[PDB]
Amino acid sequence: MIHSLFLINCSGDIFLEKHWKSVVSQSVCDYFFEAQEKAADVENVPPVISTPHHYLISIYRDKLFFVSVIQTEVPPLFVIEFLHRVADTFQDYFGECSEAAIKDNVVIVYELLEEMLDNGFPLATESNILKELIKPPTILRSVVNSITGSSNVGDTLPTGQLSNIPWRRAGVKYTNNEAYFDVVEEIDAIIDKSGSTVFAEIQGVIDACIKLSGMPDLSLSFMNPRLLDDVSFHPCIRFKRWESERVLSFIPPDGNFRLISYRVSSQNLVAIPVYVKHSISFKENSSCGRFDITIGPKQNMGKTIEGITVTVHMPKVVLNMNLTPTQGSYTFDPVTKVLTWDVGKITPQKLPSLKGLVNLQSGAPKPEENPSLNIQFKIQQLAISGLKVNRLDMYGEKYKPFKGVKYVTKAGKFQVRT
């Protein structure tokens, strides 16, 4: 399948060159450069680009372009997920994937890419097995290696690879037996100029940070399972039992882990937490106008809204803009016509708002619409979906680990028309 991988910055420079089958001429990246040039933004790059003798399938993430090369017919989903997984693993081993993170650790990343992809075929893909084939670049491990000649490369195939549960290494012990679960929900929503509900939904996903020792069998169940539909399930779950018992009985692996994801049925109205008062004036060919926005909580379920940020992409008519925020921070970059306001927190004693005058372009006609309003927000200790856990039983081990769960709602793709 995959012949080679080029890691190219948004700059236009080629940093990490890899090859698996045959030496692909670097000239093939010229086609990517041209296609990038034709588009209006880095974000507009196609994922499938055709060249006279190669195909390029690309991912965009974290200001780095990952272009691979293919010469045979391969399903696009396969390549796109393998590339997104190499990105994810880079995040896991280095916090994030950046040209600095790559170039600072060239040898380890080349070894990693060698281990993962073999002749363009998947060899090692699971997180935990990759953790034991090559160790993370821990500085204490580095000084230990320098002292004793110890190696970052293992010499024994981890037993989990040949086990009936290939997703977790066996024989892991911790003195601090504990496990954390994270149910995060996002409110996808479109709101019109009238404040009505255009289309909204809740996207929910369960994360699980597990620090259990031994071979535990964890069970996750919920008070209100009927609210769960179209639920996702990692290989670690036993699908048959969920279909029969409606129970999440499973063997979680080590380390950070995304457990299941879900959406909320459209049958139940999505509780929109935040409303807005909004007003902008655009007189035709006028040099100045007015801007008025007022953020308000509509259904907070009695909980505070925090971490609020409002971003607007102003039209070309805008030159500068004279406003005063009631709180947070007011920032405006005239080059990209981007209106960013850090709102932060909402106090019931006074609703935060942003108002003032807009320094427009004289002689420039009024834009045909007001750019829509996107807003970020976070609610702690509250899941708008109303999903609740039932119990967390354990089997196969004797300890009683620290058990806890959180419910944090973070704003989804929340956009307000105006």
Binding site: E178, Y180, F181, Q381, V389, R391, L392, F402, K403, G404, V405, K406, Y407
Partner: peptide, 8 residues
Amino acid sequence: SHAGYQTI
């Protein structure tokens, strides 16, 4: 680390 988590 255990802080902030509801008991289960």
